[PDB]
Design an enzyme around this catalytic site. Structure first.
Site, short mmCIF file in Angstrom:
data_model
loop_
_atom_site.label_atom_id
_atom_site.label_comp_id
_atom_site.label_asym_id
_atom_site.label_seq_id
_atom_site.Cartn_x
_atom_site.Cartn_y
_atom_site.Cartn_z
N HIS A 63 67.78 61.04 7.77
CA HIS A 63 66.58 61.28 8.58
C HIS A 63 66.83 62.39 9.62
O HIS A 63 65.93 63.18 9.87
CB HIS A 63 66.11 59.99 9.26
CG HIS A 63 66.01 58.83 8.31
ND1 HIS A 63 65.13 58.81 7.26
CD2 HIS A 63 66.63 57.64 8.26
CE1 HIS A 63 65.21 57.68 6.56
NE2 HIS A 63 66.14 56.95 7.16
N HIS A 93 70.31 62.65 18.92
CA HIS A 93 69.89 63.31 17.72
C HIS A 93 68.74 64.28 18.08
O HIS A 93 68.24 64.26 19.20
CB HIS A 93 69.42 62.32 16.65
CG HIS A 93 68.25 61.51 17.11
ND1 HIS A 93 68.41 60.37 17.87
CD2 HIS A 93 66.93 61.75 17.02
CE1 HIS A 93 67.19 59.93 18.18
NE2 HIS A 93 66.25 60.74 17.69
N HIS A 95 64.93 66.29 16.40
CA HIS A 95 63.87 66.49 15.44
C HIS A 95 63.51 67.97 15.47
O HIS A 95 63.53 68.58 16.54
CB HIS A 95 62.61 65.66 15.79
CG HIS A 95 62.93 64.20 15.98
ND1 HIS A 95 62.71 63.26 15.01
CD2 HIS A 95 63.46 63.52 17.02
CE1 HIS A 95 63.10 62.05 15.49
NE2 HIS A 95 63.59 62.18 16.72
N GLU A 105 58.34 66.34 18.75
CA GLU A 105 57.56 65.11 18.59
C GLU A 105 56.52 65.03 19.72
O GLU A 105 55.30 65.02 19.47
CB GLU A 105 58.51 63.90 18.54
CG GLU A 105 59.46 63.98 17.35
CD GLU A 105 59.87 62.63 16.82
OE1 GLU A 105 60.46 61.87 17.63
OE2 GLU A 105 59.57 62.35 15.64
N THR A 198 60.65 56.57 14.83
CA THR A 198 60.90 56.35 13.41
C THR A 198 60.82 54.85 13.15
O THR A 198 61.08 54.06 14.08
CB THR A 198 62.29 56.85 12.96
OG1 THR A 198 63.31 56.33 13.82
CG2 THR A 198 62.35 58.34 13.05
CU LIG Z 1 67.48 54.97 6.74
ZN LIG Z 2 64.26 60.79 18.02
#
Ligand SMILES: [Cu+2]
Ligand SMILES: [Zn+2]
Ligand SMILES: [Cu+2]
EC number: 4.2.1.1
Length: 259
Positions: A63, A93, A95, A105, A198
């Site tokens: 992801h 992390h 995006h 986001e 997510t």
């Molecule tokens: Cu997963």
């Molecule tokens: Zn995130």
């Protein structure tokens, strides 16, 4: 629960069928209308205390990629601002987009940034992350926008390891990384109550979104876009456009730390 992603057949418009909270009352991300956000003089100064942060590993989870920290003690913590008590850093992390004009986001007056960094923390009053995500004040995520321009020197060690974690399920050692090099100068922020962006979309998060973006170079973000969603030996699907769009604000107010 497996099989969600960012494609047309398993992307954000489908998530509600397995994760009905996707249509809940405090989902993230949101558009930040800067003219409607109100300065809150009750907010405390934000305290980002990362001097003893202990990074361990970087993982391609299919992801995004996560830089993981040792959270077995208060080594890297977030306090102050809207927060009651102490929140421990567990991972960060990003995006990002297929193109420089999308990838974040959160949006700011409908503006999309090229990417967004999420530094994820859990409330130490709940003992571990798994119990924290059963609480409405279990998590705090510090969000930082990325725009394309000059290089960010403190990002380069992350960019340089991505070659070694191209595909889902790959990891590499990532010790001795200082996340302070990912912050902008100003800690001015917006805050609101929200969710994970997510699946499982859990409504546990106090969001703290910095106003000042960091600048990264075109070459840095291009290397994010060479990662793969797929595993080794599977058809290549570039890891791009791994962002959820803005969700309805519903019965929430966004507060500003600055006048
Ligand atoms: Cu997963
Ligand atoms: Zn995130
Ligand atoms: Cu499943």
């Amino acid at each position: 629960s497996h099989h969600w992603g960012y494609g047309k057949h398993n992307g954000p418009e489908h998530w509600h069928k397995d994760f009905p909270i996707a249509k809940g009352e405090r989902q993230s991300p949101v558009d930040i209308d800067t003219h409607t956000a109100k300065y809150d003089p009750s907010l405390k100064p934000l305290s980002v205390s990362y001097d003893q942060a202990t990074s361990l590993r970087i993982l391609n989870n299919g992801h995004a990629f996560n830089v993981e920290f040792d959270d077995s003690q208060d080594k890297a913590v977030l306090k102050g601002g809207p927060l009651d008590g102490t929140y421990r850093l567990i991972q960060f992390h990003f995006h990002w987009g297929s193109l420089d004009g999308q990838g974040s986001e959160h949006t700011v007056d409908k503006k999309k940034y090229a990417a967004e960094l999420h530094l994820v923390h859990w409330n130490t009053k709940y003992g571990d992350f798994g119990k924290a995500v059963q609480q409405p004040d279990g998590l705090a995520v510090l969000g930082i926008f990325l725009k394309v321009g000059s290089a960010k020197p403190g990002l380069q060690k992350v960019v340089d390891v991505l070659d070694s974690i191209k595909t889902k399920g790959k990891s590499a050692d990532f010790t001795n990384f200082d996340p302070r090099g990912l912050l902008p100068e100003s800690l001015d922020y917006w805050t609101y109550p929200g969710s994970l962006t997510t699946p499982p979309l859990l409504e546990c998060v106090t969001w703290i979104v910095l106003k000042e973006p960091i600048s990264v170079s075109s070459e840095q973000v291009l290397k994010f876009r060479k990662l793969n969603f797929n595993g080794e030996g599977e058809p290549e699907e570039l890891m791009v456009d791994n962002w959820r769009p803005a969700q309805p604000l519903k019965n929430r107010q966004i507060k500003a730390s600055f006048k």
